[PDB]
Design an enzyme around this catalytic site. Sequence first.
Site, short mmCIF file in Angstrom:
data_model
loop_
_atom_site.label_atom_id
_atom_site.label_comp_id
_atom_site.label_asym_id
_atom_site.label_seq_id
_atom_site.Cartn_x
_atom_site.Cartn_y
_atom_site.Cartn_z
N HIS A 44 -3.70 -5.28 0.48
CA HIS A 44 -3.28 -5.79 1.65
C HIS A 44 -3.26 -7.43 1.83
O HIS A 44 -4.27 -7.75 2.08
CB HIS A 44 -4.13 -5.17 2.89
N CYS A 61 0.85 -1.32 -0.01
CA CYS A 61 -0.03 0.14 0.03
C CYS A 61 0.79 1.25 -0.10
O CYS A 61 1.45 1.67 -0.99
CB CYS A 61 -1.01 0.06 0.91
N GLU A 103 -2.00 -8.98 3.83
CA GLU A 103 -1.63 -9.44 5.29
C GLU A 103 -2.99 -9.77 6.07
O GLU A 103 -3.24 -10.18 7.23
CB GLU A 103 -0.86 -8.57 6.01
#
EC number: 6.3.5.2
Length: 187
Positions: free
Chosen positions: A158, A72, A160
């Site tokens: 993202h 990001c 994660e």
Amino acid sequence: MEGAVVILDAGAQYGKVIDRRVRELFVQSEIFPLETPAFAIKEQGFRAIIISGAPWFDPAIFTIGKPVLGICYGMQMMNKVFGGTVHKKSVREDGVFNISVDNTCSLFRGLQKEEVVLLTHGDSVDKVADGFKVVARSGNIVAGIANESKKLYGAQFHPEVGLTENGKVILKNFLYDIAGCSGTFTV
């Protein structure tokens, strides 16, 4: 130290979400202050860097020959350091979007040509720095960049977060294949 990953995260979680994902993959990880100087990272012998998130960071984290995953804001900074530019507030809303993926890129190995990912509201890449290819997109929105020779990879979305369906696969690709971290421990 050697074989570990350093996490520099400008977001509200202070590295914690990314750090849990690296742990789950059995890799040693340290959360460091974002303004940690690049020379200090080199002297400690970290194997790779993950940067995520105006906050001050050392531009040399991108130039010291270590593998870097920019997530990001980290991808935006990566692009910027090598001469690229960004659109301000191009993503108006948080959302889970299906995007096109370059499957032949190291980062996206084992993925489909289309993937469902979490994009947060904010900025996105405009002019892509020379030496970087676009490896993911949806429309005007660059969703991924790669300089394969330098082992520098950016993802706008993202990986994660579990809402990014195959985000674990992307992190595995980076940590194991790209960075060469072993997913092994000794007990």
